[PDB]
Ligand binder design. Structure first.
Ligand SMILES: [Zn+2]
Ligand SMILES: [Zn+2]
Ligand SMILES: [Zn+2]
Lengths: 10, 213
């Protein structure tokens, strides 16, 4: 479940 | 130790090899600079206090090396985005490999060092943002709150206007940068948690916003 916290690192 | 509590430093993420702006919160030892640095990341409160091996902490970068002072073979810290080499990315260590200046462009090439392997001959886009790597012992400690490096990537459409409307880099419905934001897996567009309801970030590895189903 992809959080914009998670992806905040490309 | 080398680095004191409250001192501003860069901490390297061992997965991706990138260095991040962080700050020393507590210092503990294990058994000599094989100590443990407890750092909190400047713009990543959600990760709280992380423990760093000493080989992965140095004094905060402060000094920019101008294009004209860049020598091949020099080892520096610069910005690169290995998934999108034309865009801004993160901060990696690199050995400068080649420079070419023509009437239209200043061309910087370097070997970017990532998590494990290196990435030879990268075309560095941000030639005016190359940092000298602070050397241990030499140079002063950074104790006063410093200016921030810019890290990517950049919304071409809102120009990262950290104060504006953006139905792209922010909620595809509103745009409010208002921890628990979630993102489509077909469109890659971000959504909130609210905008029907929700509860506590789904199990499922994939998850969706209506326009891609
Ligand atoms: Zn934007
Ligand atoms: Zn919204
Ligand atoms: Zn979608």
């Amino acid at each position: 479940a992809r959080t914009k916290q998670t992806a905040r690192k490309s | 130790s080398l680095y004191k509590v409250n001192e501003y430093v860069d901490a390297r993420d061992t997965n991706m090899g990138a260095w991040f702006e962080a700050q020393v919160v507590r210092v503990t030892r294990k058994a000599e600079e094989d100590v443990i640095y407890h750092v909190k990341y400047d713009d990543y409160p959600e990760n709280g206090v992380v423990q760093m091996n000493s080989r992965d902490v140095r004094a905060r970068a402060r000094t920019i090396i101008k294009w004209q002072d860049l020598e091949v073979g020099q080892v520096v810290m610069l910005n690169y985005n290995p998934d999108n080499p034309k865009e801004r990315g993160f901060w990696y260590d690199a050995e400068i490999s080649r420079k070419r200046e023509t009437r239209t462009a200043r061309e910087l090439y370097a070997n970017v060092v990532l998590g494990d392997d290196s990435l030879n001959d990268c075309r560095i886009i941000f030639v005016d943002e190359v940092f000298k790597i602070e050397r241990p012992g030499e140079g002063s400690p950074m104790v006063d709150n410093p200016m921030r490096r810019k890290s990517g990537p950049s919304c071409k459409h809102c120009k990262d206007d950290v104060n504006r409307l953006c139905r792209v880099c922010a909620c595809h419905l509103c745009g409010g940068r208002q921890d628990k934001q979630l993102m489509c897996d077909e469109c890659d567009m971000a959504f909130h948690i609210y905008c029907p309801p929700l509860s506590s970030v789904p199990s499922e590895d994939e998850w969706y916003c209506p326009e891609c189903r």
